Write a protein that binds this ligand. Structure first.
Ligand SMILES: [Mg+2]
Ligand SMILES: [Mg+2]
Ligand SMILES: [Mg+2]
Ligand SMILES: [Mg+2]
Ligand SMILES: [Mg+2]
Ligand SMILES: [Mg+2]
Ligand SMILES: [Mg+2]
Ligand SMILES: [Mg+2]
Lengths: 198, 222, 204, 233, 196, 212, 222, 196, 198
């Protein structure tokens, strides 16, 4: 599976997603973005089954974008996420379930705090300081549990991700060709184009 | 459990000449080690200067052929008696076959006739619709025996001109209906010797501007 | 999974007027992957040739085994083994392993040095002998070969002609086989002399 | 998607210069138990067709019902019901074939093998087979189940090719069919001694013989057989 | 296969059909299922033709030797041998056998060795596929110390029924009479047993 | 089967082999693995022949409908998402296909989308699909430069196939070349691999291990 | 495969077709299925050919030895008993189905052995895929007390039954007559009805047609 | 289960044992396997008790309605209903039923609808697991146009046999007589049928 | 599986082997040597099932060493390989086969030529200019087939190797942690400690 990590510092949420797409025996692409901007202050990263992955993401995007238009308002990350959990929780008991896992990081402009949500394909949702899906947790949680602090700056977190990405590249068998990182803060969503070296 | 499919052996061969085409098929119909009939045609005239054969599981072959023949009927209806061109016929069949992509017609079908320029034409299909226009193509049990031969005697593969150290390919002269038929017959006798399913009779349908002509030859009965 | 369809390869043998011929392709592969284009499947113990197709380790083994056997045979008998004799040897050698066979398909070809009568024969993986005077085929393209042979073959061909015939047979049959090709070798065997030729063919 | 229960075995038949003969025993077997002895398996349809059926009986009984309705329904608003617009063997066949092919295409087959033997209004003999898969074929002789393996070889000795049909008398054909039926009693464990035969001739019309028995059986030699090898007495 | 052995006043009779099938095909319609293991000890064979033929051949041998060394073997002993073979090799055998023999002190005796390899001594016994159908008929019409004539009929009736109903049975009815006076081979044809 | 499509200065190069097999049996050496959707879009064949041939021919239709509705050339992105979304509708049914939807439009420039029966749609610069992919990738990766000329690029694709046709048992027959430009695509022949291997060997000096 | 054994008034005859098939392919269009166990004891086999040959030769050999050791002509019941005890030993794995016939001091005999080791005796028997077509004929024309000529015809026709009606059989008929007072006569190809017709063309290639890369002389001698 | 229906001079009689088992446990030993589907049309139920109880219930109704609109139903009609249900739903049923009825024009009539849903009219029929054992006794001792007394006995004997051999049958023997004169219920205990 | 590559230039045989050892979910070691020196001019690399892999190689080693002593001679590479083939061809029909594949590179002092042998767990032996096992062939053969030349220098081969390794790191899904390269020539067996960058 792909790597999906997220860490919410004090003023923002940083998400890192592997850049590799493997189909069978070969690596097709080494520059994939496994994330969609739900609203200008919420982002969602995703990992799972080939097609379900993008399809679900895009469906969620569209629906959040529509709410934004109909109401001239941006749902809170919390809202956006309860919406997603429900959609997933609906699919587990369908004809053919979307096999998708996602991380939702958003800055709640109303509370003025960053938020990270972790939801798996079963509709299990949880709010955390840092999180990941699949095995990514296994390698990094020990590091996160150790160095994480609520009052971390955007820069402190980026380094913790770096240290985490390092462990993954050391102990994980598959080459995920690196990660794309993005930060969600009060001013929006930006892509830290400096995570190949920072 | 019930198995909706079966195998009735048989072998067909379509060859397209410069200005004619042939669709030949043995006549034997079998089930396992028993001979069901020594004479049950499998290459038919569908009208419109089009011959077709759906070889494999006879029921499916039957149904398909019926649906197509019928498709020709309606085409004339919904389009003021317009002749169905071989290529149009072809695309149609793709649709017929593919319509059953989840419970396929267990057959390998071929059809032959003349295209709009009057040049011989043979088309062959996947049991699910994949299709292509071809020079010659064998289908069925003895396909594997007849194909290499045709590759050699028709497309002159691997044959080179004497004294050129193998750097000059044999010239691609084009065959006459009479010559093609020899190759067909041979293809079938040879097949009859080495494949148990093949035998009894060979029925050939020859398509030309003058219409559709049938020839028949007997094969070994063991 | 079918050991007889992993490495790929074919062999064919034909008889003519005072001679026999036996050819084989050269591909050695592992499923779809071509691995070597220099795997001859024809061997000889004196004036008897054995072509073997099938699982390559077994092809190798058997070859090793028959040399060994034909070698001792020569020491004890003080003469080179004959086609007919070798044949029974191969058969009995294969049936020896009736319940855990060598996944191969042998073809014997040679001319009895005393009688001069050309000889070829073939077997299935457990010794079932096939003795026909026309031709014998073995390998992944057996069906193909039969087709070609049954059509191209005619009795009493002269060495020079048999050659062409067998080459063509082999060549076109191989062209319809995925696991065969990458080169071909043909032996034209006569009482006194034996000529070996490599054929030019598609390398795909 | 079923599994036959009570069943009927071979139905043999062949065509001769002026018509067709078809025959079938009268057994309904429940596996290995020869349960029902009075089962007619030749179903005459009109004065020119007989449908012989083997396989599952409940399904055969249904095909019966279906054939009767075919007749009834053909009479409807048909002033020529017993003449130019009566059921031809060919119509009956096609109906049947079609049904069979549909039931299989819906995976709920009519677990049977049927032979439609008859003579068309213009004189042509008609003999055609269809089974639970919608497979159909025609030939001078036709037989289902064991009859196919045993009966056809015998019958084909009389009519090997089309040209032999016009050279065959009813006497001959009938004799053949009867012998075949005898062979099957010998070799088929599910056969029965009593059978039914029907001839559809282009002149005499339909002749339907009921309650025939296999006779002229060779068994005497069974006395000179003892042991299975070295036993002398 | 339909087989039975009935003991009577003068001894015992063994009867059986003559049909061996491989599926619905009658491989052999004139099979002899009445096997001699000794002069006056015969056995009826039901099950794998191969398994039984072998077992028989072996008992026949063990008994020949028994004889050479210790004289004529009892039926009880013939049985014990069969049992031994059937029981000890149960995992690889499909055979049900009836052993019937005649002796001067014991008159006739009948033993049935069912699938598990057990042995049961009985007045008569029936076995084979066709036996299912005649348990009723047999348990009804059987009386002890019958005459040869009576016994012959009882066997001829029971077995014609079994042949009637079971398709795995048919052909001719064979019998073997074991009495002091000797050994008699009887054969009844379909033309006779079919209509009784 | 081996099919590649790569993007560059002069446009897009699509090259495919032409062998179809049924087990070890070579059914045809003359299959068209490039489905000509319409004069501007190209689709490749891999997986199920019917599935590709059919659904891409259909794609050819849907695009036409769109160009009548909106009087504007359908974008490759759009062209591919249709196939893609269709394919995703049947996910689980057993469709087998992996293809590149190639096109060169004013708005997008040259574009290649990989779409497969699993519902994957991806945009990339180089893609190879089929049993012989790894072999073509090997050649492509090392000789691929954006600044390539149409002639060289054609060759590169042609060769990459050659590579795969040699080693992979399930690929061969002949190579078909296509150059996609903004004014549409141009066919660059069918080249029989037999004749091509000898020529390339002789000229280039490679495949030295092979005797000839 | 079709093999029959027919006993006559003073001997026994056995016959068989001559087609060997690997799946649906005629491998040997004329193999022999009549084996000699001893001069006057022959058997015909069907099933795994290699097995019928092996079990045949093996027993034949052990039979040749028992004879030499006992200075007595071989006996059929011995060949029988030996085959049956060996086949039985191998619980069915030696797929040999045989009809063993032959004359010896005690008279003529005809038996059949099934691969699991069970034997049968009769005046006429048959085995193989053609088993039923052949038995059909025997069950129609056999009678007690056939002359040597009637039996040959009979056994001969029966094989024809299988040849024509069984895909698993074909080519020719082999017969072997074992008459009591005389020597056994093996009639190879007593009947030859399936001859391939003259091909319609000559595929004799013109010399030099093939492309050669390298030529060389192989050394055979030491 | 052992059940049979025998037509005689004055009509028909239906009899059955009274044991329903789940494995080797006798769930109910006094079951009643004789079901009334109409005044003079009864049936014998073998197979899944759930499947047959239902089918009966449905036929009974179908017939009650038939009556209301068109008068008393013939037995062949009651059977056609059974068949219809049994055949149309073969996939989901394990029921074997024998229908027996009385009519003034037709006297007694017996129909057996075996597992596949086919129908067969016969002089008498037997079914249930216990049936296998008495095919012989029955095909022998049955005569047409017998007296009520004789029929009762024939039925009482056949079933006692079936009960004897089959473990799945037992209890008491129940019979139901259907004649012009009415409907009579007969019951025979183990202390009587066991020693005949 | 692991990577095993060999290429015999004109005067030597270069063998490169992945350095990674994976056990389930984690990479245990990033510096493993998958080769044994059979004789001073014959090297054997290997890849396959866990224990079998080493156990087989060590066995071969000991057995080739003992012959060198008993005879005071060094078997030709050809001899060494036939021996190895035979040992494999024997295990394929044993109780539990050695699931091992090996390449044998040796410099034949007598012939004065380099030699590379490829033998699979089945006993399939073949001699080639370059070879590999597992999937390694699929990515690199295309490159080797293109650039290989019999008269290559040891240096030319090492570059070609490099290129091959590059392709593998690009398109291959698992991280094999680089390779260890060894050259076998007339003067012996040396380890090119410069293949991380050359
Ligand atoms: Mg048109
Ligand atoms: Mg044939
Ligand atoms: Mg035949
Ligand atoms: Mg083969
Ligand atoms: Mg090839
Ligand atoms: Mg290739
Ligand atoms: Mg019977
Ligand atoms: Mg009880």
């Amino acid at each position: 599976m792909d790597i999906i990590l997220g860490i919410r510092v004090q003023d923002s949420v940083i998400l890192a997603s592997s850049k590799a797409v493997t189909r069978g025996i070969s690596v097709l692409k080494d520059s994939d973005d496994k994330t969609r901007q739900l609203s200008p202050h919420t982002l969602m990263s995703f990992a799972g089954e080939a097609g379900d992955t993008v399809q679900f993401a895009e469906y969620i995007q569209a629906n959040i974008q529509l709410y934004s238009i109909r109401e001239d308002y941006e749902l809170s990350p919390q809202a956006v996420s309860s919406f997603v959990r429900q959609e997933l929780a609906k699919s587990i008991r369908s004809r053919r379930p979307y096999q998708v896992n996602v991380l939702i990081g958003g800055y709640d402009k109303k509370k003025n705090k960053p938020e990270l949500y972790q939801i798996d394909y079963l509709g299990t949702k949880v709010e955390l300081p840092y999180g990941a899906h699949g095995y990514s947790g296994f390698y990094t949680f020990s590091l996160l549990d150790h160095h994480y602090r609520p009052d971390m700056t955007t820069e402190e977190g980026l380094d913790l991700l770096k240290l985490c990405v390092q462990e993954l590249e050391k102990r994980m068998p598959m080459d995920f060709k690196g990660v794309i990182v993005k930060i969600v803060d009060k001013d929006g969503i930006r892509q830290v184009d400096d995570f190949q070296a920072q | 459990q019930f198995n909706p499919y079966g195998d009735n052996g048989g072998t067909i061969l379509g060859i397209a000449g410069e200005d004619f085409a042939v669709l030949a098929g043995d006549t034997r119909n079998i089930t396992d080690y028993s001979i069901n009939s020594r004479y049950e045609p499998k290459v038919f005239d569908c009208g419109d200067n089009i011959v077709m054969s759906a070889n494999g599981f006879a029921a499916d072959g039957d149904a398909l052929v019926k649906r197509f023949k019928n498709s020709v009927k309606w085409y004339h209806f919904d389009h003021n008696d317009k002749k169905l061109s071989i290529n149009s016929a072809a695309r149609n069949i793709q649709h017929l076959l593919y319509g059953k992509r989840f419970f396929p017609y267990y057959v390998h079908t071929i059809i032959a006739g003349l295209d709009e320029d009057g040049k011989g034409a043979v088309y062959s299909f996947d049991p699910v619709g994949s299709y292509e226009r071809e020079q010659c193509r064998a289908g069925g049990a003895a396909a594997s025996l007849i194909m290499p031969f045709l590759d050699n005697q028709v497309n002159f593969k691997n044959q080179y001109e004497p004294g050129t150290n193998g750097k000059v390919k044999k010239p691609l002269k084009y065959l006459s209906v009479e010559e093609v038929i020899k190759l067909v017959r041979d293809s079938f006798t040879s097949a009859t010797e080495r494949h148990i399913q093949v035998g009894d009779g060979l029925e050939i349908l020859i398509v030309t501007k003058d219409g559709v002509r049938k020839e028949f030859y007997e094969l070994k009965r063991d | 999974s079918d050991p007889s369809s992993i490495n790929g390869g074919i062999v064919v043998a034909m008889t003519g007027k005072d001679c026999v011929a036996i050819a084989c392709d050269l591909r050695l592969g592992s499923q779809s992957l071509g691995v070597s284009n220099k795997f001859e499947k024809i061997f000889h113990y004196g004036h008897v040739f054995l072509g073997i197709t099938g699982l390559a380790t077994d092809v190798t083994t058997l070859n090793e085994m028959f040399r060994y056997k034909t070698n001792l045979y020569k020491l004890k008998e003080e003469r080179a083994i004959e086609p007919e004799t070798f044949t029974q040897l191969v058969s009995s050698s294969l049936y020896e392993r009736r319940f855990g066979p060598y996944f191969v398909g042998p073809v014997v070809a040679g001319i009895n040095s005393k009688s001069g009568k050309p000889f070829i024969a073939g077997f299935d993986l457990i010794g079932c002998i096939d003795e026909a005077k026309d031709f014998i085929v073995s390998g992944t393209a057996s069906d193909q070969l039969f087709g070609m042979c049954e059509s191209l073959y005619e009795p009493n061909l002269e060495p020079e002609d048999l050659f062409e015939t067998i080459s063509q047979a082999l060549l076109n049959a191989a062209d319809r086989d995925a696991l065969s090709g990458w080169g071909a070798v043909v032996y034209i065997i006569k009482k006194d002399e034996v000529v070996k030729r490599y054929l030019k063919m598609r390398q795909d | 998607t079923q599994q036959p229960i009570v069943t009927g075995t071979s139905v043999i038949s062949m065509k001769y210069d002026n018509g067709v003969i078809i025959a079938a025993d009268n057994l309904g077997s429940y596996g290995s138990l020869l349960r029902f002895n009075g089962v007619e398996r030749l179903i005459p349809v009109g004065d020119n067709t007989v449908v012989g059926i083997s396989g599952d009986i409940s399904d055969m009984q249904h095909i019966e019902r279906l054939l009767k309705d075919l007749v009834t329904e053909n009479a409807y608003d048909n002033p020529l019901a017993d003449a130019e617009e009566a059921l031809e063997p060919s119509y009956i066949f096609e109906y049947l074939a079609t049904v069979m092919y549909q039931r299989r295409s819906k995976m709920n087959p009519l677990w049977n093998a049927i032979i439609v033997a008859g003579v068309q209004s213009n004189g042509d003999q008609f003999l055609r087979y269809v089974n639970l898969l919608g497979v159909t074929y025609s030939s001078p002789t036709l037989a289902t189940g064991f009859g196919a393996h045993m009966a056809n070889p015998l019958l084909r000795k009389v009519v090997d090719r089309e040209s032999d049909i016009p050279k065959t008398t009813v006497q001959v054909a009938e004799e053949a069919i009867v012998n075949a039926m005898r062979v099957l009693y010998y070799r088929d464990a599910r056969s029965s001694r009593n059978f039914s035969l029907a001839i559809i001739d282009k002149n005499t019309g339909l002749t339907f013989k009921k309650n025939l028995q296999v006779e002229n059986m060779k068994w005497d030699f069974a006395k000179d057989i003892k042991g299975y090898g070295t036993q002398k007495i | 296969t339909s087989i039975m052995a009935v003991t009577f006043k003068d001894g015992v009779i063994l009867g059986a059909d003559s049909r061996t099938t491989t599926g619905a095909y009658i491989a052999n319609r004139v099979t002899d299922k009445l096997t001699r293991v000794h002069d006056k000890i015969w056995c009826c064979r039901s099950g794998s033709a191969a398994d039984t033929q072998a077992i028989a051949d072996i008992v026949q041998y063990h008994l020949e030797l028994y004889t050479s060394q210790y004289g004529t073997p009892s039926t009880e002993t013939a049985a014990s041998v069969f049992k031994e073979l059937c029981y000890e090799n149960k995992d690889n055998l499909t055979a049900g056998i009836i052993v019937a023999g005649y002796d001067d002190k014991n008159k006739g005796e009948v033993y049935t060795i069912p699938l598990g390899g057990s042995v049961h001594k009985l007045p008569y016994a029936i076995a084979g596929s066709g036996s299912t159908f005649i348990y009723g008929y047999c348990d009804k019409n059987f009386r002890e110390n019958m005459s040869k004539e009576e016994t012959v009929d009882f066997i001829k009736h029971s077995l014609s029924q079994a042949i009637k109903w079971d398709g795995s049975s048919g052909g001719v009815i064979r019998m073997v009479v074991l009495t002091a006076a000797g050994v008699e081979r009887l054969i009844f044809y379909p033309d006779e047993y079919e209509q009784l | 089967t081996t099919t590649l499509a790569f993007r560059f200065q002069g446009g897009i190069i699509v090259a495919v082999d032409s062998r179809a097999t049924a087990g070890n049996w070579v059914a045809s050496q003359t299959v068209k693995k490039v489905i000509e959707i319409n004069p501007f879009l190209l689709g490749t064949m891999a997986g199920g022949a019917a599935d590709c041939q059919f659904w891409e021919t259909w794609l050819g239709s849907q695009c036409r409908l769109h160009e009548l509705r909106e009087k504007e050339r359908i974008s490759v992105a759009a062209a591919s998402k249709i196939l893609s979304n269709l394919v995703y509708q049947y996910k689980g049914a057993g469709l087998s296909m992996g293809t590149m939807i190639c096109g060169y439009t004013r708005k997008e420039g040259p574009t290649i989308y990989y779409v497969d029966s699993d519902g994957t749609r991806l945009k990339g610069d180089i893609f190879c699909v089929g049993s012989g992919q790894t072999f073509a990738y090997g050649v492509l990766d090392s000789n691929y430069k954006w600044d390539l000329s149409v002639e060289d690029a054609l060759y590169l694709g042609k060769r990459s196939i050659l590579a795969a046709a040699h080693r992979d048992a399930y690929s061969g027959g002949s190579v078909n070349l296509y150059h996609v430009t903004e004014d549409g695509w141009i066919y660059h022949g069918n080249h029989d691999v037999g004749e091509l291997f000898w020529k390339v060997k002789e000229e280039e000096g490679s495949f030295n291990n092979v005797i000839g | 495969t079709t093999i029959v054994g027919v006993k006559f008034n003073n001997g026994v005859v056995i016959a068989a077709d001559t087609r060997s098939t690997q799946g649906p392919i005629v491998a040997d269009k004329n193999c022999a299925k009549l084996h000699r166990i001893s001069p006057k004891i022959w058997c015909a086999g069907a099933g795994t050919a290699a097995d019928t040959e092996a079990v045949t030769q093996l027993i034949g050999s052990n039979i040749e030895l028992h004879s030499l050791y006992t200075s007595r002509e071989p006996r059929v019941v011995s060949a029988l008993q030996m085959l049956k005890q060996h086949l039985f030993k191998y619980q069915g794995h030696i797929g040999a189905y045989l009809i063993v016939a032959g004359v010896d001091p005690t008279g003529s005999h005809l038996f059949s052995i099934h691969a699991h080791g069970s034997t049968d005796v009769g005046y006429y028997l048959s085995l193989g895929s053609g088993s039923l077509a052949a038995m059909a004929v025997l069950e129609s024309h056999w009678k007690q007390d056939l002359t040597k000529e009637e039996a040959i015809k009979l056994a001969s026709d029966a094989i024809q039954a299988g040849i024509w009606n069984d895909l698993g059989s074909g080519s020719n008929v082999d017969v072997c007559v074992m008459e009591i007072g005389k020597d056994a006569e093996y009639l190879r190809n007593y009947l030859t009805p399936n001859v391939r017709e003259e091909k319609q063309k000559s595929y004799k290639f013109p010399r030099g047609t093939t492309a050669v890369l390298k030529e060389s002389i192989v050394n055979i001698c030491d």
